[PDB]
Amino acid sequence: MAMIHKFSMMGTNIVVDVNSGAVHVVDDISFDILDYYKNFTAGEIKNKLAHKYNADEIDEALREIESLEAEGLLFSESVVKALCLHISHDCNLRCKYCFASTQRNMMSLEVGKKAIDFLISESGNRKNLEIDFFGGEPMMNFDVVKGIIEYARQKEKEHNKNFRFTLTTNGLLLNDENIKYINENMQNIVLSIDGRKEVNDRMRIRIDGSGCYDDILPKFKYVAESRNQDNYYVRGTFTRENMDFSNDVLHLADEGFRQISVEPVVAAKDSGYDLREEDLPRLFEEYEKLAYEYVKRRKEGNWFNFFHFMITGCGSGHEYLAVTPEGDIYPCHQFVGNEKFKMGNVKEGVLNRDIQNYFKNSNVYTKKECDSCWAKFYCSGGCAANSYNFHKDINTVYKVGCELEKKRVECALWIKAQ
Ligand SMILES: C[S@@+](CC[C@H](N)C(=O)[O-])C[C@H]1O[C@@H](n2cnc3c(N)ncnc32)[C@H](O)[C@@H]1O
Ligand code: SF4
Ligand code: SF4
Ligand code: SF4
Ligand SMILES: [Ca+2]
């Protein structure tokens, strides 16, 4: 499986050798060489490239590319650590693209602590433990969150562990007092806002239809600077309704957000919101359009971090598990619908292993469609929710949500070239 990927993006030619991880910026002549190198002689390539370059400059271009091959940078040849807590399945929003379009109960405190104990028991001897407060809207049940935190740190002393708490909130229930507590206790907070106001208020709406932009932007802007524009990010979701998502990222940057994350929709088949292949040469340009601007404001007064350019696996189902409010264990937040992937309850606290191993053995070596790919050692490993939603199987590639990430890998590699 000796292969390379070749791309040229905004006046530069970069090459990736997949097994090595080596990255090369190359000139036009050696860039056109690799169209023929592995299958043609040095004598055959002269007659081929005898309209743009001449024999000597061709051979010198062969010289080093044949030495990178000789150097070996061309053609080279389970323990659970995090729990996604569903502190609530109720919510005060009705976002179109969200799975919570279906009941409505609150995680009890006794199920929370049975979630902390389950994590410690299955953590092996890993010291760093992650607890994500998620679900519907966790702040609707903030009493329990404070109780789970105060309970975990009593356990940190006894079990030689360390808990890393993150919250993800729609914004509506942040106030002066819970924003204090959030910054002396949560290591990271995720703010859900979709960017421009017409885009956000289009779909992050309440039961009545009214939006949430005007209410969350004031408190989001502040939580960011209360924590010095770090240890947070604003989390946006672009669907078919806003494929110009670059302005969404930059509008959030213009409002003073250094840490921004904008991602495609997951498990959005047959909703009208998912992105199709026809949109791929539409979504690509704004990724490139984005990667250009981050370099443009890299060292200037303005600057912003886009999470998907910052360069294992995602871990859902073997290293990362979601806990329903009743204690039920699921591979991730996106699977608590499907009952077949039910893996146990944190009360009884014993984990189903062969669903766990079924998920652990779904990596870039396992699936046949990945072994052909150039970004296998650069990828997230895919999204199991997207695979089962588009093909009812955890181990077949979801072609769109995949060429998106390959372009982000291409955009992240390209930023580091400057
Ligand atoms: C599921 S919500 C739960 C936490 C909290 N209520 C909030 O929105 O911040 C967390 C994040 O997941 C994202 N999300 C919801 N449904 C999604 C979907 N179908 N595809 C991709 N992201 C989604 C939303 O953008 C939201 O920011
Ligand atoms: S707020 Fe979070 S949970 Fe409620 S709908 Fe919007 S995304 Fe789903
Ligand atoms: S990108 Fe999709 S296909 Fe290429 S490796 Fe990562 S997951 Fe497998
Ligand atoms: S499966 Fe898809 S959605 Fe569930 S965690 Fe891994 S990536 Fe996020
Ligand atoms: Ca700690």
345 forms beta bridges with 328
What number does CATH give the domain 82-309?
3.20.20.70
- Residue 203: CB atoms within 10 A of its CB come to 19
Closest CA to 20 of 38, 39, 36, 1: 1
Query: Residue 124 corresponds to which amino acid?
Result: G
Give me ligand 2 centre to Cα 140, in Å.
Answer: 12
Q: Which residues line ligand 1 (CB under 6 A)?
A: 97-99, 134, 136-137, 168-170, 192, 235, 237, 265-268
Going 69 to 74 to 75 to 76, the CA torsion angle's sign is positive
As annotated, the binding site includes: 8, 28, 91, 95, 97-98, 136-137, 156, 162, 192, 204, 235, 237, 266, 314, 332, 370, 373, 379, 383, 402
CA distance 259 to 256: 9
- Residue 25: CB atoms within 10 A of its CB come to 13
Method by which this entry was solved: X-ray
Residues of the chain with a following break (C to N over 2.5 Å): 77, 102, 311
Closest CA to 63 of 27, 13, 20: 27
**Atom 8 in ligand 2: which residue has the minimum CA distance?**
98
Non-local (6+) Cβ contacts of 370 within 8 A are 363, 364, 376, 379, 382, 397
Q: Where in the chain is CATH 3.20.20.70?
A: 82-309
Q: Is residue 191 within 6 Å of ligand 2 at its C-beta?
A: no
Please report, for residues 124, 145, 168, 237, 413, the alpha-carbon distance to residue 188 in angstroms, rounded to integers and kept in the order given: 24, 14, 9, 19, 26
Tokens for 87?
Answer: 């502190």
Mutate which of 87, 89, 137 for ligand 2 pocket (most atoms within 8 A of beta carbon):
137
Pairing verdict, β 13-17 and 23-26: antiparallel
Are 81 and 320 in contact by the 8 Å Cβ rule? The answer is yes
Give me ligand 4 centre to Cα 316, in Å.
Answer: 6
As annotated, the binding site for Ca(2+) includes: 8, 28, 156, 162
Tokens for 271?
Answer: 């909703």
Q: Is residue 194 within 6 Å of ligand 2 at its C-beta?
A: no
Q: Which residues line ligand 3 (CB under 6 A)?
A: 364, 369-370, 373, 375-376, 379, 381-382, 397, 402, 405-406
Task: State which ligand 4 atom lies nearest to the alpha carbon of 332.
Answer: 4
User: If you search the block for the tokens 């199991």, which residue do you land on?
Assistant: 384
CA distance 299 to 1: 40
Resolution in A: 2.7
**Atom 4 in ligand 4: which residue has the minimum CA distance?**
332
> At residue 22, what are phi and psi to the nearest 5 degrees?
-65, 145
Are 297 and 89 in contact by the 8 Å Cβ rule? The answer is no
Tokens for 33?
Answer: 């060489």
Please report, for residues 84, 323, 335, the alpha-carbon distance to residue 346 in angstroms, rounded to integers and kept in the order given: 12, 8, 16
The helix (H) or strand (E) run that includes residue 328 is strand 328-330
Going 409 to 309 to 364 to 324, the CA torsion angle's sign is negative
